[PDB]
Amino acid sequence: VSKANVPKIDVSPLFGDDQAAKMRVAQQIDAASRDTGFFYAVNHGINVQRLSQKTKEFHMSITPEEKWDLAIRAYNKEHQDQVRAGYYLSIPGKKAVESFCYLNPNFTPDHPRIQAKTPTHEVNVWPDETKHPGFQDFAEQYYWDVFGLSSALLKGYALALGKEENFFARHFKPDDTLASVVLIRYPYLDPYPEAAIKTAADGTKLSFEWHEDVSLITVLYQSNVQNLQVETAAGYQDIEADDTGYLINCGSYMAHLTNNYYKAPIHRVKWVNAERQSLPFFVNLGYDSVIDPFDPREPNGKSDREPLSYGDYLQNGLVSLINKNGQT
């Protein structure tokens, strides 16, 4: 199979000052978050045509030499400082997906978290400007564009839960956010390497197994090829594609801080032999950010869950995800 109910929510009021309109958006976010857990944000104001075209030009023009120079430590032992940021290589005949991950552009050598060598903070690596003109400028601008959309969404989630609109957004700051952009290429391959196809317990051929996201929320642009499925009690359901909207879901940090009132939906990626793009922005807070858990089901909102520092959550969650679902 069946198809998931994934509503399209006009999020434009979240950028404005009509408070009643904001509440009507928040109600729709609440409804979706308590149902399948996914919704499409529409009327978001981001030029997703330029995003997809510039990402395609990068993926199609980068060479093996450049990939080694940008590779994370899993693929290049020389790059001990690149655990998150850099290029994640495909393995011809074995691993189809490749991607490029970048972090907060404000993470420079002058940044105190970099000076202190705090885990999960890294300085971005970029290709040579003369080989990829304008790519770094585009990607950094995009980070702030999607940061802005994400800030607005976080106001909607706060209002949906009965909190003041800055409840989450006050911890989502340009100077310290651990948020990341990943530019993922899923290629068309003929023949397609069987090693890159996993078989689910229910027989479905997959590119990436079931998981909960390591994030507060995930803000995803994908090209118009259906691939995602969400788990419900009655089985997995297909999420329809829409290459004009952003697909939104909660990560496991939201589930923790709400005592599972907004669950982190379990989802997986079906195998499809088609050239496509998957461009997630993982909304992460700062390393020291802590939100006191609460339970919206209780009159008093009391929760017995321990507050969890975002940095420790993220460090543990990224490693766990690699261990469970494989090095991407």
Ligand SMILES: [Fe+3]
């Ligand atoms: Fe995911």
